[PDB]
Structures are given as structure tokens and as C-alpha cells.
Amino acid sequence: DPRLYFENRSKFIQDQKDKGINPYPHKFERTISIPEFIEKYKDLGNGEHLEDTILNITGRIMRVSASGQKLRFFDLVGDGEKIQVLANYSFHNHEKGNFAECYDKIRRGDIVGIVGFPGKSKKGELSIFPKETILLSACLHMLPMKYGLKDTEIRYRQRYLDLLINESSRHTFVTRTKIINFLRNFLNERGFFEVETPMMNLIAGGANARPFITHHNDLDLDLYLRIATELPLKMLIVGGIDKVYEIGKVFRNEGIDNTHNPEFTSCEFYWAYADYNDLIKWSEDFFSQLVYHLFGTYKISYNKDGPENQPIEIDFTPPYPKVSIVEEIEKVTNTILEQPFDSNETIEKMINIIKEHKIELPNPPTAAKLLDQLASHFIENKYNDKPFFIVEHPQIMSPLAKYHRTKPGLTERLEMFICGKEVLNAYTELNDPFKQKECFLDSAFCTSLEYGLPPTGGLGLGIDRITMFLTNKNSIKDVILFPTMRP
Amino acid sequence: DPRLYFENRSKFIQDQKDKGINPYPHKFERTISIPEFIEKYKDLGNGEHLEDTILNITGRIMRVSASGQKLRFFDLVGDGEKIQVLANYSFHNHEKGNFAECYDKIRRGDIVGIVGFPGKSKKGELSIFPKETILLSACLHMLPMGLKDTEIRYRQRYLDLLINESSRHTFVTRTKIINFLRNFLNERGFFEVETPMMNLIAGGANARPFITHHNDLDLDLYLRIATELPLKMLIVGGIDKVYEIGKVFRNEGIDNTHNPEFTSCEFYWAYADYNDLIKWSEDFFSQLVYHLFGTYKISYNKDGPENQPIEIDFTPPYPKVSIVEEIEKVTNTILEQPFDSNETIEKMINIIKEHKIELPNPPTAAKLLDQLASHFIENKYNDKPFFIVEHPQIMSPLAKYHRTKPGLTERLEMFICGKEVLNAYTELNDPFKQKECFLDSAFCTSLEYGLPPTGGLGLGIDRITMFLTNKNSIKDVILFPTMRP
Numbered sequence A: 001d002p003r004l005y006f007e008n009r010s011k012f013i014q015d016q017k018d019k020g021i022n023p024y025p026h027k028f029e030r031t032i033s034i035p036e037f038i039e040k041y042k043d044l045g046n047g048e049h050l051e052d053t054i055l056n057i058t059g060r061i062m063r064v065s066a067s068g069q070k071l072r073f074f075d076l077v078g079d080g081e082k083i084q085v086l087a088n089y090s091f092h093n094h095e096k097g098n099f100a101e102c103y104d105k106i107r108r109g110d111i112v113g114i115v116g117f118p119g120k121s122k123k124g125e126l127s128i129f130p131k132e133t134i135l136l137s138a139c140l141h142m143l144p145m146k147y148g149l150k151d152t153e154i155r156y157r158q159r160y161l162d163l164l165i166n167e168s169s170r171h172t173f174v175t176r177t178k179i180i181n182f183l184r185n186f187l188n189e190r191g192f193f194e195v196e197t198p199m200m201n202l203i204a205g206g207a208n209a210r211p212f213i214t215h216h217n218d219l220d221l222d223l224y225l226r227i228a229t230e231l232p233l234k235m236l237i238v239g240g241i242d243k244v245y246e247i248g249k250v251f252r253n254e255g256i257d258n259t260h261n262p263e264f265t266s267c268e269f270y271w272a273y274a275d276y277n278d279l280i281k282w283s284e285d286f287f288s289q290l291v292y293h294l295f296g297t298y299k300i301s302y303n304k305d306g307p308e309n310q311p312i313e314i315d316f317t318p319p320y321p322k323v324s325i326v327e328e329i330e331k332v333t334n335t336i337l338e339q340p341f342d343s344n345e346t347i348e349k350m351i352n353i354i355k356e357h358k359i360e361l362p363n364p365p366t367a368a369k370l371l372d373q374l375a376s377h378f379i380e381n382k383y384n385d386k387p388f389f390i391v392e393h394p395q396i397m398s399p400l401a402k403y404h405r406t407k408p409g410l411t412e413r414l415e416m417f418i419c420g421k422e423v424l425n426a427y428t429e430l431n432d433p434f435k436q437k438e439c440f441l442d443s444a445f446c447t448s449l450e451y452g453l454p455p456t457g458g459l460g461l462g463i464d465r466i467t468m469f470l471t472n473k474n475s476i477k478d479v480i481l482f483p484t485m486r487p
Numbered sequence B: 001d002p003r004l005y006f007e008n009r010s011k012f013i014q015d016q017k018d019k020g021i022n023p024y025p026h027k028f029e030r031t032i033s034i035p036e037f038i039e040k041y042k043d044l045g046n047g048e049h050l051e052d053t054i055l056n057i058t059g060r061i062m063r064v065s066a067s068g069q070k071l072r073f074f075d076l077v078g079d080g081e082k083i084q085v086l087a088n089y090s091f092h093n094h095e096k097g098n099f100a101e102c103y104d105k106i107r108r109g110d111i112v113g114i115v116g117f118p119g120k121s122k123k124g125e126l127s128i129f130p131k132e133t134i135l136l137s138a139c140l141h142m143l144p145m146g147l148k149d150t151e152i153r154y155r156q157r158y159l160d161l162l163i164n165e166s167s168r169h170t171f172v173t174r175t176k177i178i179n180f181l182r183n184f185l186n187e188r189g190f191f192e193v194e195t196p197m198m199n200l201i202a203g204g205a206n207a208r209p210f211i212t213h214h215n216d217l218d219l220d221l222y223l224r225i226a227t228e229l230p231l232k233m234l235i236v237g238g239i240d241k242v243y244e245i246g247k248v249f250r251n252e253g254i255d256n257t258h259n260p261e262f263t264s265c266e267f268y269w270a271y272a273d274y275n276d277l278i279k280w281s282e283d284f285f286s287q288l289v290y291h292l293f294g295t296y297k298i299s300y301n302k303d304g305p306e307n308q309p310i311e312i313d314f315t316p317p318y319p320k321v322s323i324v325e326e327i328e329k330v331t332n333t334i335l336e337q338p339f340d341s342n343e344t345i346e347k348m349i350n351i352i353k354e355h356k357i358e359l360p361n362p363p364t365a366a367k368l369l370d371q372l373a374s375h376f377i378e379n380k381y382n383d384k385p386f387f388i389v390e391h392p393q394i395m396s397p398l399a400k401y402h403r404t405k406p407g408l409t410e411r412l413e414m415f416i417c418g419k420e421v422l423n424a425y426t427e428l429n430d431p432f433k434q435k436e437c438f439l440d441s442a443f444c445t446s447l448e449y450g451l452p453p454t455g456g457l458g459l460g461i462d463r464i465t466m467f468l469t470n471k472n473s474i475k476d477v478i479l480f481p482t483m484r485p
């Protein structure tokens, strides 16, 4: 029980090897899985056995029970579904070892191949009746019980233990790929095209973050890891790919939070001849149909304050509330910020309302980062009953967004927030090389615009944050398999 | 013409802004795309006009030709398809400006917005009849008129995708291949996942890894060379059918068939053996080739686009050869075990020099066998893909020992024109038989909880698209490959 269980099971493998019994066989020819076994023999008669249809099935023993040395009860799991094993001495093929020698050797956690027939016990339990039982691979360690996990960080370290004990985690991850599959098929329906852009570049462009640094030995270059796929995707639209998208990982060297991770899955599409309204119409259709594709209703339950407090209802019914960033800030505080924002009359007009409201000052106090913290404390945690948009950002905050059609100083940028956390960022791209801020971003992108970029609108998604709200999870390490951990 | 055209056009759009014309308008809503335009109005009569059905279309001009200053001819390209522009003077709206100036400004490469009606040309071409054309995005640089076989096509792919209609046909099939692969595995109950690309140790293959540093934890991490270890750990977790189409990073040479980062897919099939992996690859490759072309045989310019092309027959089954057996037969020598013994190493050292082959340093057991297989097995059959099977355990640290032949494993490698596009074997699920479980301890411990008998397979997506798109270099199937400044 302490640590000696790892020793005798290890010697048990050696005792089987010396006696001539190979403990890890090569191939077991199973003819039926467990989920299909459940679907095929679900409505059998209580006590009915199908003796003429023998089946070969595999699985992992999760409960070892006995009753008289000649009747042994097991729990065989596989692909998230569970059936019972009713090993009876009279049904055992008395030609491959003794019954006791064939069943006293296996314990909890062992992968075993079963040769038997389907049937239901008198208690009404669908079970497989093995005439032959062969150990495929033994579990040398002591597996914890049901509620002996999902507490410590052993899940984030050894996820294979968390996937075999808690039905939640398996449901968290089958819904994660269900989202990615729904998102991939959603774009393909609109004629989008999936591509692959490089991840090791000589410049860190696309967003605002802190990059990584690696080195190529055969070339002697110190390359930067990407933070987004903004620049290469636009170059492909110049190449004729009007509808293009890409799903993949992006790297960030920021602080690790419950919504922040060193690496996470990104998704950016770029729609040619699409304006500001085409994006919000695309966003409201995507999130609404997604939660309806999963839960059958636009209203979902989500414990915002951990599993210890009551949840809050998140309504995904379009249209979502649109909010202007500069217009809402100057109303809740009645501090009129006149453009230009990078002046000196207004840059401290908002400094005297961030330290006056007991909020951390962001250094450097640039007009772009001041409006960011002002929006993060006055607009973000506004509508938790339903997601909302923060639209019409200033041009100081979005150096890659096209000028607004009428309103000066602003742009057509939009950010969707769920429970106050950004999960979407979209704007109409700035296809003017002369009205650009950075070309006076690498030259590979500045030269790409000089060849002609159509009026394009882009959008980025946070899939790792989306799965958090769509699975009632509060941490970023719950929605990814192997999060970065400290030894 | 040099940069003067780019600098004259840069001033040309500057004057257009001063005159009061926006060269980059915000929105111009189009009603129908160019591919939809062809699929609808193709069955018209030569010269038939539909002057009542007006449409809003967009595209990029790739051809400018004058003809009597009354009819202007253009080639509008959009989404890999082309249409003609019949700018008849009688149909032009003269209120929007001078008909001469409204079309003398349109150069090659400009993105324009056309408002007009469909129909066929006088000669019989499907054309669009613009009532008015408005420039939305101007191409300042001169588009290369086709003298494109240089090196700039790798650094500036957007130029290579507009001028060469052939390269767009190859990158569209690379997506169709991945779309076929994902659906192939998903239709077989496989469950796609995502393993972290930044691991504490690089494992799963045999290559030098890239190493970066995190600024919050202040320890150096290794970029993955293969998703092998994190995937089979999910097999221990209950996912009996798991795969991951993604990217890996290997820090080594850059040749026509090697890139510092490439796309690879690896699926792990529980309760499947070596015979199940051979049947899968034979089925997957034959169905993929037939899905793209309609036949199992294809043509491929192995020696280059100028030399004669060879044919590849993807009709299953494919030949299988044991690596240790065929090497002994072609060189008439016997390589007794152990393969890393001084006597066997010496024989492998000499045989490659009797036939004048370079020595792959370091002269080890695996390196000598790997070189002995590339210059004696992979270059003998090119008409069909073939499997090189039953590798020694010294060449495969993670492959299960052969169930019948001692000293070997149940490995299989598929080759096309002598290049490895696939690798598979039954996974070694015995934690004691691993020489290295005494790699990382975080993976050997996962085997201690019981790994069922499974069989994994790896695919080289970038190499597979090469032989299916008739490309000699791997940089031709990658959008933006690694390029030196």
C-alpha cells in the first residue's frame, strides 16, 4: 500500500517472464469496442445470454471484486463507457491455465483482452462473460479512487490519471475539439481557405507582447517566436486568397494567469471586401450557433466565481450590445477627452482619474495603455448576463486598423468580452501604405501592401478562453492537456 | 523599368487623393464573385448581352490592352479564375469622369470594382461589361511579366501566387490533402488533440532541438521534435484513438527535402499491431491519390522539370522488404548480432567504402545501418511506394521487439522515390525493456501505469505533398519557408 506495491508488481512481471508467460502480448484481435457493445446489447432480457455469438473485447479493469473464488466481478472501461465482467469458473475455457491462476494475477488498472459472449445478469446488469482472459498490459502503480483526485495539481502534471477517473475532464476535452471542428467547418462553409504560416520569424509582429528567442545552429540566426499570425495571413490575401484562415498555437512570454498561458491556440481569418458590419454579423452568428450546437440552447450556466459559488447565466442571443470605448468612458466619469489623446491636456486628465479611483498606474503612461486600463475597469465587467462588444477603438490603440468612415480619431475595431475577458478582436485592415504608422512590423509586410491589399477585415479568436466559459471552468490549465508547469 | 514606376505610381495615387478621389475606399459591397460569375453565365451565346441584369464584381487586373480607344480589354482574376472585361464605350457612364482618364489609370495588378452586366464577347469569351470601374487597391510596383524561376518567389509568396497559376494549384491540394487526412481519421473514430510544443525535454525522434528561454520561470525549454511521447500518454488516459496534425521543430540541415520546421501528423491506434498499420497506410495512400486525381498512377519529375518524369503506381498492396535481410543479400555479407559489435561495425564500415559511400559520422550502429539502407534499398525501386520493415532494436528505442525475429522490431517505413514519407511501428509498452527507463522520467512513469498494446504511425505532410504536386524542393510546398536575409 505505501510504496511496496510498485515492487511486487514489478517482480510479478519478472516472475511471468521467467516462467514463460509473456506479460505484454503483441496483438489481441478484438472484434467489438465497448461503446458499440453498449449500443448493440442494451435492451437484452434480464438473465438472457447470447451463447452462439462470441466476441473479443478489450478494456481496463477499474474494480476488482470476487464472490466464492469461482465468480469474479470486474468493471471494464473503454472510450469513456463502462461494462461489467462476470467471470464464472464453469464458463472458463479450462485449457489456457487454471481459472484461479488466470484471474488472481490481474488487479485494478490492468489492460486485459476478453474472449466471451454478451449477456445480462439476473440483476439486470449488461456484462461480458469471458471464457478466456489474457492480460495485455499491467498497471504497476496503485490507481487512486474516484474522488481521490481532481484536487491537487496531479491533473495538470499527469493528465492521463485525470482522464481515467473524472468524467468531467473527458467531457471538457471532447467539447474542446468539438469547438475546433465546429469552427473549422464553420469557415469552410463560407468558402474560407486553411493555410499554414511559419512560427519562427526574424521579427515579432502581429500584436503587442513579449516574444521568445531561439537559435538555428546550421544558420546562426537568433529567431523570434510568433505572438500572432497577423502579418503572413495578409500577405496571402495579396496573393489572391480572398477568404483565408489559420488555426494554430501562438507564444507569449507574459505572466501566467487563469486566462493567460505561455502558449495557446489562436485563430485568425481575413475576409476580403468585408466591412465593420460583416465582422459583427459573423461573430454574432458564430458564438450563438456554437453554444446551440453544443448545449441546444443559447443560455448556458457558468460558475464565474469557481465551483464554490453560484453560477451566472450567460445568454448568447444576438444581437450583442455594442459599446464605444471612448464614448462610454467619458460618460461614466464625465471626463471629456478631446483628441488628440497623445496630447498633454488629456493624457493626465485620465491619469487624475485612474490614481484617483485606486487603480494601478501602467508604466509607461502612454495614451494607448491608459485607455486600456480605463476600459478594463469601467466597461469590461458591465454585461455578464450576455457577451458584448467594445467597438470604435482609438487609432492610437490599434495601429493596424483602418480609419473610421466618419468619426475622426477612431477606427472600426471591435472586441467581444465574455464575463469581462477578451475573447475576440477584429477590425477592418488598413490597406494604405502612406497612412501607415510603422513603415516610417517588418518590411516584408510593408512591401506586401505596396503591391495592393483589397479592403479587408480581419478577426482573431481566443479558443483557449472560449472553452473556459463553454465548460464551466475558471482556469486555463483545465482547458488544455499539458499546461506549462514548474518542476 | 526600375523603381521609377513604383515611385511614379506612389506619386500618382498621391495626386488622386489631392484631386478628391479615394484610392482606398472603405467598403464596396460586391454582389457576386468571379468563380460564381463563371459558373452562372457560361452557357450564353457568343455576343449575347444581358443588359438588364447588373452586378457588382471585384478582381485584380492582370492584362491591359487597347483596341481603338472605344473598347478596353482586361483580364480580371479572382480566386484562381479569370474573366475578360469588355469596357464598351457605348455602355460607359460618362458622368463619373472622362472615359479616357477612367481607364488610362488602370494598370496591371490593380484591384478594381466593376458595376455592369454579364455576357459573352464578340469572339466568344465570357466577359463583364462595366458601366463604371473604381480603383480600390493599386499595385504600385511593376508586376513581373515568365522569368519567375528565381529565389524571390520564396520570400514573396504573394507574387508567386498571382503570376504562377500552377503554384496556387499545388497549395490548394496541400489543404485538400490535410482535409482528406483529418476526415480519414475522424471517420475512423480518431480524436484530435493538442500537445504542448514547448517541453522540458525534446523526445520522440533523433534530431537536434531548438532551445528557447522563458522570462517568467527563467529556465530553458526545448521545442518539440516529435509529438510521440505526449500522444501515447493520452492512450494511457483512455483515448484509444488519438492524433494531432501539427508542426514540429528540428534544428539541422536545410536541403531540398529538409526544413527546420515542418508539418507532421501522428495517430496512435490502440489494440492495433504491425499488420494493422500496414493496411492503414496502403488504404490511406491509395484513397488519397484516387481522391485527388481519379487514378492510382501518377507522374512525377524526379530528376527535375527538364528531365523525363517517372511514374508512381499507388495501387495496393505495396512491396515490403526487411532492412537487415535485403542489405545482406545485395552485399553478400552476413551482419551477425549485436550490430554495434566491433566485428559487425567493421563490416558495415568497409562495405560502404567498397562501393564508395561517405561515412556518416559518428560511425555508430544505427547510422551505419541507416546509410546502408538509403544507398542499397531506397534507390532500387521507384515505380511504386514500398515499405522497409523489421528494423533492429538499436535503430528504434521506442519500438516493440519483433514477436518472432529476435533483435529486430515491428517497424515499417514507406518510401516514395527513395524518400521517407511515413514511419510506423508497434509501441514498446513494456517499461522494463526500455534501456532509457533507468527521454525523461515523466514519460517512463506514464508507461508504469499500463500502456495497452498499441501501434503508432507518423506522416510527413510536406514530403507527401511534394510527390503529389510534382515538386523537387520542399520550399515549393511550404508557403513561407525559412529564408536567410
Ligand SMILES: C[C@@H]1CCCN(C[C@H]2Cc3cc(O)cc(O)c3C(=O)O2)C1
Pocket (backbone or CB within 6 Å): A228, A252, A253, A254, A255, A259, A260, A261, A262, A263, A264, A266, A267, A422, A423, A424, A425, A460, A461, A462, A464, A465, A476
Ligand atoms: C489572438 C487572440 C484574440 C482574442 C484575445 N486573445 C487574448 C489572449 C491574450 C493572452 C496573453 C497571454 O500572454 C497568454 C494567454 O494565454 C492569452 C490568451 O489566452 O488570450 C488573443
Ligand SMILES: C[C@@H]1CCCN(C[C@H]2Cc3cc(O)cc(O)c3C(=O)O2)C1
Pocket (backbone or CB within 6 Å): B226, B250, B251, B252, B253, B257, B258, B259, B260, B261, B262, B264, B420, B421, B422, B423, B458, B459, B460, B462, B463, B474
Ligand atoms: C514524423 C515524420 C514521418 C516519418 C519521416 N519523416 C521524416 C522527416 C524528417 C525531417 C527532418 C527535418 O529536419 C526536416 C524535414 O522536413 C523532415 C521531413 O520532412 O521528414 C518524419
Ligand SMILES: N[C@@H](CCCC[NH3+])C(=O)O
Pocket (backbone or CB within 6 Å): A206, A207, A228, A229, A230, A268, A425, A426, A427, A457, A458, A459, A460, A461
Ligand atoms: N491578430 C489579432 C486579432 C486579429 C485582428 C484583426 N486582423 C490579435 O492577436 O489580437
Ligand SMILES: N[C@@H](CCCC[NH3+])C(=O)O
Pocket (backbone or CB within 6 Å): B204, B205, B225, B226, B227, B228, B266, B423, B424, B425, B456, B457, B458, B459
Ligand atoms: N515520431 C515519429 C513518428 C511516429 C512513430 C511511431 N510512434 C517520427 O518522428 O518519425
